[PDB]
Each structure stands twice: as C-alpha cells, then as structure tokens.
DNA sequence: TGAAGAGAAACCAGAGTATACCAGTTACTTCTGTAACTCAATTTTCGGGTCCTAGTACACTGATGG
C-alpha cells in the first residue's frame, strides 16, 4: 500500500512493507536504476544511441545534448550569495573566537558512526544483498538511564 | 443703741428633663439535593514539553619540566 501522511508531518498510515517494496521494484523493474554495481570514446557512441532511443531524437541531437549538458575545493570564496555570505561571516567569527578549530569529539563520533560502513563490499559475494532490499532505518530509544533522558530521549538508529 | 436676726439681690451647681443613639428581636423568604437531557462557557488538572543557565565529560592540545 502507498505510504501517506496520516498525521500532517509526523506519521504515516499503516502499510505493508512487502507491498511497498514490491511497488517500488515494479516501478523500477528493468529500468537500470537498481544496480548495486560500482560506477564504471567507443562508449560515447553507445550512449548517444541510447539517448536517441530513449528521447526520440537523432544521433546528432543526442551528441549535442551530451555536449551541452556536461558538468558545469578552493577555500577562498568571494562575490557571495546570501547563504555564502552567512557562511563567510560565521567562518570569520569562528576564526576570531576559536583557537584550535578542529572537529569536536562528538562531531567525529557521529560522523565515524554514520559513515562507518559505506561502500564496504562483501568479502564473500554470497552475502551480497539483492537489488532492492528495503533497508529500514529504525531508531531504538535508549531507556531512561540518566534522569535527563526523559526530556530529550536519546536513541540509536539501526539500518535494519 | 446696737444685737440678733429680717429682708434682699446677686451667683452656682445639680436633679430631673430632654434627647440621642443603639441595640433587640418575628417573620418571610431563598436555597440547598437528585434527577435528566440539552449546549456553551469556564475551570481544573495533568502529562509532557520548553527554554535557559550552569556544570560535565572527554578527547585533544599545548606546553613543561626534569
């Protein structure tokens, strides 16, 4: 069944997870969007033929699209935008209020827990997961260990 | 021919007299409870947040000294 907001922005209606995964794998069935492969002049011609086949255009038009839509750090930042200006001001104020300016232990902790296993390939390739496996991001609320854990409920999230 | 009282025109306090409040009580009403459905207004209460100031842990930094 379709997941839809039961509450405006807090909660969905009860829906079967298997049905939802099947809807998704049905709408992406054999479209090449669920690959789980790593990202890889002769290929240019095949790509242009594919674009001509999928967009009903000419090989010349496909090559033109491939050329024009091409992709289009350095800490210096000038000629700012709104949020870029806010970031510049924040950076300058931090440069004068802080003396060591390195990632706090909680920042590195949250990051190194989040990005602990990303792109980690299976050693066996027999425990490789199938294309389309519906990872659920549960988060289990810690019990009330400290008294203040009633106010702001700490949780640990698991990618089931 | 004064003497011991006789009369006479003043003050002066006080005892009824006059007020002056100041309670002292008889009917004669409302207002309870319970019941009920109704609806809106208002209160209470109640679990949980909410913000805020103040420490606190903890990994790292930055010398420091022997």
What's the rounded Cα separation, in Å, for the pair A88 and A68? 32
Longest dimension (CA), chain A: 69
The closest nt to A105, taking CA to C1', is B59
Q: Which residues pair with A139 in a beta bridge?
A: A157
Q: Residue A155: helix, strand or coil by DSSP?
A: strand
Closest CA to A66 of A54, A78, A84: A54
The closest nt to A152, taking CA to C1', is B49
Q: Hey, what are A26's tokens?
A: 């049905």
CB distance A1 to A16 below 8 Å: yes
The beta-strand segments (E) located in chain A are 5-7, 11-12, 137-141, 155-159
Nucleotides of B under 7 A from a protein CB: 49-51, 58-62
Q: Hey, what are A67's tokens?
A: 């050329």
Q: Å between A86 CA and B55 C1'?
A: 31
In a 13 Å sphere around the CA of A97, the CA atoms on its Cβ side amount to 6
Strand B contact with A31 (CB < 7 A): no
What's the rounded Cα separation, in Å, for the pair A97 and A93? 6
A159's enclosing H/E stretch is strand A155-159
Q: Å between A62 CA and B28 C1'?
A: 107
Tell me the CA distances in angstroms from A123 to A59, A60, A117, A126, one per residue in order: 42, 44, 13, 8
A12's enclosing H/E stretch is strand A11-12
Q: Å between A125 CA and B11 C1'?
A: 145
The closest nt to A104, taking CA to C1', is B59
What's the rounded Cα separation, in Å, for the pair A117 and A78? 36
The closest nt to A151, taking CA to C1', is B49
Tell me the CA distances in angstroms from A42 to A18, A38, A45, one per residue in order: 41, 20, 6
Indicate the angle between helix axes A59-68 and A42-55, nearest 10 degrees. 110
Q: What is the DSSP pairing of strand A155-159 with strand A11-12?
A: unpaired
Strand B contact with A102 (CB < 7 A): yes
DSSP letters along A28-60, please? Answer: TTTSS----PPP--HHHHHHHHHHHHHHT--HH
Annotated resolution, angstroms: 3.0
Strand B contact with A147 (CB < 7 A): no
What's the rounded Cα separation, in Å, for the pair A65 and A72? 13
Tokens 């890889």, residue located: A40
* Burial of A113 per CB tally in 10 Å (0-12, 13-18, 19+): exposed
Query: In 10 A of CB A2, how many CB atoms?
Result: 9
């Amino acid at each position: 069944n379709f997941p839809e907001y039961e509450l405006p922005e807090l909660n969905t209606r009860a829906f079967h997870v298997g049905a939802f995964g099947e809807l998704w794998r049905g709408r992406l069935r054999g479209a090449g969007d669920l690959s789980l492969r790593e990202p890889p002049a002769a290929d240019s011609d095949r790509e242009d033929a594919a674009v001509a086949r999928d967009l009903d255009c000419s090989l010349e038009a496909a090559a033109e699209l491939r050329a024009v839509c091409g992709l289009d750090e350095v800490i210096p930042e000038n000629t700012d935008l709104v949020t870029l200006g806010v970031r510049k001001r924040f950076l300058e104020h931090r440069e004068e209020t802080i003396t060591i300016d390195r990632a706090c232990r909680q920042e590195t902790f949250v990051y190194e827990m989040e990005s602990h296993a990303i792109g980690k390939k299976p050693e066996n390739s027999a425990d490789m997961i199938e294309e389309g496996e519906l990872i659920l991001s549960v988060n289990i609320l810690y019990p009330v260990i400290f008294h203040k854990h009633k106010e702001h409920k700490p949780y640990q999230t698991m990618l089931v």
